[PDB]
């Protein structure tokens, strides 16, 4: 049984590898060599935030490109006004070690979580004005790594227990739970359709789960380290995965394999964040070298570098409209570039 | 300048004042990370430091200064990822069952893993060898010998510069000093001075437990300032 099952699993893995290799007609480079060069993208700092107290460890852009949510390691969420730089909201968290934060697509709810293993969703449009604990849901036996809102009543979350889960706000329980990975899930990213979402864990692989059914339709197994960041392509057919090996990889849902590996010899520090622009040409990735990089999703050439921060960049995000890019680092300073 | 924008600026200034009032306390407080396996007496330590939650924060005041000890005993076995967030903390208190020789190997492995960590490379790791009474009773009973697990214990000489406590049997002193020497060897390895261990023999009832935290954190901050303030 165990031996025959192991042999069958090995044969299935070899068959999947052979099928993925047969469809590997060519690499993304051969086709992205004719496209004109993108040139240097020299982004300058338009805003400078000086409100955070501890290391900024999370961020996200809501439906409105003017409000920016950012979480600090002291248990504090801050919704900044990107345009006027003012502080729209300040939420003191009951958990000091917060590592994830997201802004609901309706602009009324904001999620957070971390080592507390309890995802807390606060409401911003409360009749009482003050920020209230809307839903402090629990059930995960591990630290929360990322949070993403699917609607005003459901939210997907990834915990250190190796299992992701879609919870319902009104019910406050798991709408659905996905099978556990080989390691702790570290990042999440929703597709434009909100039906499927790809998630990466400590194991060198990324699984594409479905919101309708709890099953990973695809499982990429290309990496040489633990994935710490992941972001979906604006179209939803591909997604970039970043690990601590200082190398990003663009996987595709249709081809079911890596398209291009963004890496450089002078970069030895791991990666912590990955994000795309509204078009997808510019792949932005935060590196532990106290600076962020921006490569060409097609050409893979170094398009720009952001060395404004002074500490390890923790997270970065592009606006829904692409007017600017926010970047939160461990220097307690979040910078908006454009 | 519009009136609503002026009101928003005033709200932002109020939020800045609030965040400054909060940062006052956040800066006047010291962060400590308590680590230890299930066999380790970290629970008894927290019970003694009384001067599905994956994190447990405990505030205790000593010598008119606060200490926020963070105990994590409700998470997965591996801790290479969630440990990164605990950088810049005051100190890391590692607990180990110095009496149970069976788990001593795993305790040393975990200590070496937490010491050679890339993110905690510049973070001191305080060491409390809890459960000294059980260790003394075991080494006096003679039924369990450290030689069975560590061959070096058979060719290990008692330190000449030792400081045996009053009323301690030679075997107890030799065993505790061998444990401390093993820990110091595992620590100094690739230490580079940026971070040093602080082995301390802690009993199960010794009220002077947080005093050890204070005495260790004082020297840790002194050493960290000698480098930042351009002294050494």
């Amino acid at each position: 049984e165990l031996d025959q099952l192991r042999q069958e699993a090995e044969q299935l893995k070899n068959q999947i590898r052979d099928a993925r290799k047969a469809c590997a007609d060519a690499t993304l480079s051969q086709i992205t060599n004719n496209i004109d060069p993108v040139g240097r993208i020299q982004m300058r700092t338009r805003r400078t935030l000086r409100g955070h107290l501890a290391k900024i460890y999370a961020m996200h852009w809501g439906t409105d490109s003017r409000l920016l949510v950012s979480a600090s390691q002291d248990g504090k969420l801050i919704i900044w006004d990107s345009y006027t730089t003012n502080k729209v909201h300040a939420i003191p968290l009951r958990s000091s070690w917060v590592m994830t934060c997201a802004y609901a697509p309706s602009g009324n709810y904001v999620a957070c979580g971390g080592l507390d293993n309890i995802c807390s969703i606060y409401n911003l449009k409360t009749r009482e004005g003050n920020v209230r604990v809307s839903r402090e849901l629990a059930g995960h036996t591990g630290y929360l790594s990322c949070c993403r809102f699917l609607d005003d009543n459901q939210i997907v979350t990834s915990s250190g227990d190796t299992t992701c889960a879609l919870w319902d706000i009104e019910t406050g329980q798991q709408t659905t739970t996905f099978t556990g990975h080989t390691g702790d899930v570290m990042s999440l990213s929703l597709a434009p359709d909100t039906r499927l979402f790809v998630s990466g864990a400590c194991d060198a692989s990324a699984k594409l789960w479905d919101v309708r059914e709890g099953m990973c339709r695809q499982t990429f197994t290309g990496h040489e380290s633990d994935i710490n960041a992941i972001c979906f392509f604006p179209n939803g057919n591909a997604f970039a995965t970043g690990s601590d090996d200082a190398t990003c990889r663009l996987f595709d849902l249709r081809a079911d394999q890596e398209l291009m590996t963004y890496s450089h010899d002078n970069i030895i520090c791991g990666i912590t964040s990955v994000s795309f622009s509204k078009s997808g040409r510019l792949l932005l990735a935060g590196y532990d070298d106290f600076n962020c990089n921006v490569w060409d999703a097609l050409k893979a050439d170094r398009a720009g570098v952001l060395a404004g921060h002074d500490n390890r960049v923790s997270c970065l995000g592009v606006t829904d409209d692409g007017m600017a890019v926010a970047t939160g680092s461990w220097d307690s300073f979040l910078k908006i570039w454009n | 300048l519009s009136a609503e924008d002026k009101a928003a600026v005033e709200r932002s200034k109020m939020i800045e004042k609030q965040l400054q009032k909060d940062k006052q306390v956040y800066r006047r407080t010291l962060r400590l990370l308590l680590l230890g396996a299930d066999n380790s007496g970290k629970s008894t330590i927290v019970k003694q430091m009384r001067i599905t939650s994956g994190i447990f924060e405990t505030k205790f005041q000593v010598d008119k200064v606060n200490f926020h000890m963070f105990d994590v005993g409700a998470q997965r076995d591996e801790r290479r990822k969630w440990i990164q967030c605990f950088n810049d903390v005051t100190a890391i208190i590692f607990v180990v069952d110095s009496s149970d020789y069976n788990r001593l190997q795993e305790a040393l492995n975990d200590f070496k893993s937490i010491w050679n960590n890339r993110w905690l490379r510049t973070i001191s790791v305080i060491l409390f060898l809890n459960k000294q009474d059980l260790l003394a009773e075991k080494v006096l009973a003679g039924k369990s010998k450290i030689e069975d697990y560590f061959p070096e214990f058979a060719r290990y000489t008692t330190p000449e510069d030792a400081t045996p406590e009053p009323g301690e049997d030679p075997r107890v002193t030799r065993a505790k000093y061998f444990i401390r020497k093993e820990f110091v060897d595992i620590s100094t390895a690739s230490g580079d001075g940026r971070h040093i261990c602080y082995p301390h023999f802690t009993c199960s009832v010794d009220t002077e437990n947080a005093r050890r935290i204070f005495n260790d954190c004082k020297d840790i901050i002194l050493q960290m300032n000698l480098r930042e303030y351009n002294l050494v």
Partner: single-chain antibody
Amino acid sequence: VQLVESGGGLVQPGGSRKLSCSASGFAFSSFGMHWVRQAPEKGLEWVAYISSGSGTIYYADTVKGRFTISRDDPKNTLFLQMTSLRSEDTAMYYCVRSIYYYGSSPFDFWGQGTTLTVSADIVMTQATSSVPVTPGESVSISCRSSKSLLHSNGNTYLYWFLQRPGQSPQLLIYRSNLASGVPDRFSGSGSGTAFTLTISRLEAEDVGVYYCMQHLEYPLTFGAGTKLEL
């Protein structure tokens, strides 16, 4: 959420009076307070404003010197001390909460107010004061202003308040952006100069007085008000 006002009554000319307002159901300090007067058989008129934490205070050019506003945050209360009360002071005063930030709706909750009887800013002018209409039809109230409320930031600093028989003015629109608790029947349109409030389907609860207000400059000025009856 409640704003209960008190302290009104009869006052002789030249006297004084402390109008109090107890707030509950929300963070009183987080919301700036506005004292707005309404003369008998007339429309609204802003009087005073106190920001959060008492960091900023403003009064109308006609009420400066006599009226002074203050707020006790420990008790979540507002006070307005009036001195040398004149004969024109006969009116009903209302306390309104307003929080200012992107996506907010300032002047969202109006208190019941209290009646007190005696014995160059932007002006809002409405064309019609009363429009007869029956349920089922749609209404289009117009509003004119002497200064363009379209600020360089692009925000339409226009507020619509609906005061019903026996109730206080209710916020309809704060910036075409519909207000909270108001059905989608009410809509706003127009440019920075002219404005239009459109009701697609009338109901028995829509009868009342609609007042327009500008918020470009701190010194406010309400319009004459358009009346809708059965």
